[PDB]
Design a protein around this ligand. Structure first.
Ligand SMILES: CC(C)N(CCCNC(=O)Nc1ccc(C(C)(C)C)cc1)C[C@H]1O[C@@H](n2cc(Br)c3c(N)ncnc32)[C@H](O)[C@@H]1O
Ligand SMILES: [K+]
Ligand SMILES: [K+]
Length: 552
DNA sequence: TGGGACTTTTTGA
DNA sequence: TTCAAAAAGTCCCA
């Protein structure tokens, strides 16, 4: 790694100032002149140095009141520095050099005496035996997903942090849990993390832990905005407390324009109160396992559709992920590749990518998949294995199932069942800016970037493929799905079965007209001299029908 | 260097 | 035996 020295992970100063102010704005320094403020991912001290400055001003502005109320010899301006570093600032980080630099910076904040002990711990914050809780906790924890996390460390997290970390969870789930655990009664925590846990299936346990253990004061959701320059992550700020209150309401600040520069205003509060953000309140007591954080109009819209629709896609359809070859370059070839003359056409499948999926129809495929699982003997079709697949034999053997012997070196890692793909079905891209559900007539295969489903036999008399793609591609359903969809990056939502199959659908008197409009759209889209203007008009008419059906 | 087009296979269950 | 989730995405260009 050692990319931390570049500065891409440095938290923007406006974010840091907001989080520190959020935690310390209303601290009664007279009542408690010994607040413990902690950052368990302090790094070089982006947060902790600002904490020092805020504390110094807070002590200096009340120095005489402190001198009068308490030991008058102890409370002096010249003593403020020492008192802060002795009793107030706490930092933990696993990088020794970061701790050393932070110690030097904190010591140089004053610039002889005997010695000042700075409470900086070089350790694994997730393993440290914390000997006391803290008044305030701030910072930016590390984010590490299931692929990039070390195996032994992952075993430790699975054993010890099972309440929030399991399956495809992230390391910052555990940091959330640790922060909550060591926060004092009545304390306040404020952190910047990825936003994905708000909606992701992996974050269900983490959402339950937060909801049941702290009061969430505020969620700032930047959606797909690029808060961290040259980092592909979407960020949010969470502020929570352990204060005894009867109010269970959350301030949600949801950005409206993802193309804004965060330095537009001198402070984050100006941006939050501006027209660039929307604000609304969510009753924490009404949160289910999912957190539906939308304004009143969207909530009314969502509840109307949920109540009106008696079926869901999961009820009526069978869903599946695409082929996972485990090495696409060894099995995927251009349809015009001369090497395909070496492969019998019985082994060749049409192969599409997510970009080949439009609304209602799939682009003509330009790639072929060698379904190598049907190769019986290694001696037969030896040219295919020697001249096409074997070119990547080493990387093929590094696959998990090849090393365990479950798969031959030339087989597909996850070849699924051919019969699921070789039928009329609906396909949609796994990540997209809008609903794009297409009817596949061409027995197209795909990788995991395209998901498929087909209608169950018992529901074929009630739902047709043409009707489903009509309502699923409508503006109503685009908005409806995005209400709870998992926002990933700028103009990209996840379209994964764990949320797509929860989409609810309806049947009523408009079924025939909606289906007919969808058929007209498909017929136009499949023409030779295509002009989509009529398609847009038909789509507008269909959207009007769907809005009439759902009463919105 | 910042923004847009596009998306693999490793992995736990 | 074999499913599906996971962006500190990845990569290119003006
Ligand atoms: C990095 C980021 C994604 N993350 C936050 C931004 C840190 N900010 C910063 O400014 N870091 C930094 C910068 C420069 C250096 C030098 C000395 C090499 C120049 C060191 C740290 C990760 C930070 O959290 C620390 N970390 C990682 C783990 Br994993 C961990 C842990 N288990 N316990 C405690 N601290 C931990 C990590 O040590 C890390 O600090
Ligand atoms: K006194
Ligand atoms: K982003």
């Amino acid at each position: 790694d050692t990319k931390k020295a570049s500065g891409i992970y440095y938290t923007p100063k406006i974010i840091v100032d907001y989080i520190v102010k959020k935690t310390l704005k209303n601290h009664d320094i007279i009542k408690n002149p010994y607040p413990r403020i902690l950052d368990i991912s302090c790094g070089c001290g982006n947060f902790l140095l600002e904490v020092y400055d805020i504390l110094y001003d807070l002590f200096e502005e009340n120095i005489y009141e402190l001198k009068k109320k308490y030991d008058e010899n102890y409370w002096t301006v010249d003593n403020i520095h020492r008192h802060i570093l002795n009793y107030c600032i706490y930092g933990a980080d696993i990088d020794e050099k970061a701790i050393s630099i932070l110690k030097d910076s904190l010591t140089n904040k004053k610039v002889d005496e005997s010695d000042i002990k700075i409470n900086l711990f070089c350790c694994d914050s997730l393993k440290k035996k914390w000997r006391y809780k803290f008044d305030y906790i701030v910072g930016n924890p590390p984010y590490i997903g299931h692929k990039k996390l070390e195996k032994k460390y992952k075993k430790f997290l699975l054993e010890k942090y099972s309440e929030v970390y399991k399956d495809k969870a992230d390391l910052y789930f555990c940091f959330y849990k640790k922060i909550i655990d060591i926060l004092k009664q009545g304390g306040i925590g404020s952190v910047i993390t990825p936003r994905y846990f708000l909606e992701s299936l992996s974050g269900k346990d983490l959402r339950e832990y937060i909801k049941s253990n702290v009061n969430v004061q505020e969620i700032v959701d930047f959606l797909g905005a690029n808060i961290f320059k040259n980092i592909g992550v979407s960020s949010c700020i969470l502020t929570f407390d352990k204060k005894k209150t009867k109010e269970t309401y959350i301030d949600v600040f949801k950005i409206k324009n993802e193309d804004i520069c965060i330095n537009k205003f001198e402070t984050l509060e100006e941006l939050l109160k501006s027209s660039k953000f929307e604000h609304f309140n969510i009753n924490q007591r009404l949160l289910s396992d999912e957190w539906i954080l939308v304004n009143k109009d969207d909530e009314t819209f969502y509840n109307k559709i949920q109540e009106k629709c008696k079926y869901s896609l999961e009820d009526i359809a069978i869903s599946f992920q695409g082929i996972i070859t485990g090495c696409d370059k060894a099995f995927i070839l251009s349809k015009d590749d001369v090497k395909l003359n070496l492969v019998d056409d019985k082994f060749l499948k049409c192969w599409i990518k997510s970009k080949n999926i439009n609304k209602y129809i799939v682009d003509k495929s330009e790639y072929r998949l060698i379904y190598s699982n049907d190769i019986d003997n290694e001696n037969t079709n030896k040219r295919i294995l020697d001249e096409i697949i074997g070119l990547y034999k080493t990387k093929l053997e590094n696959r998990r199932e090849c090393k365990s012997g479950i798969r031959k070196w030339y087989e597909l890692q996850w070849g699924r069942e051919k019969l699921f793909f070789e039928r009329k079905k609906i396909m949609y891209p796994y990540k997209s800016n809008e609903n794009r559900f297409a009817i596949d007539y061409d027995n197209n295969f795909s990788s995991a970037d395209v998901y498929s489903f087909f209608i169950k036999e018992e529901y074929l008399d009630k739902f047709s493929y043409e009707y489903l793609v009509g309502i699923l591609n409508s503006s109503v359903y685009d908005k409806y799905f995005k209400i709870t969809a998992k926002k990933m990056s700028k103009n990209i939502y996840d379209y994964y079965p764990n949320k797509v199959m929860k989409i609810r659908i309806f049947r009523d008197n408009n079924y025939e007209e909606i289906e007919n409009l969808s058929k007209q759209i498909i017929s136009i889209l499949l023409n030779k001299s295509i002009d989509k203007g009529k398609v847009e008009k038909l789509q507008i008419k269909m959207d009007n029908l769907i809005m009439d059906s759902l009463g919105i």
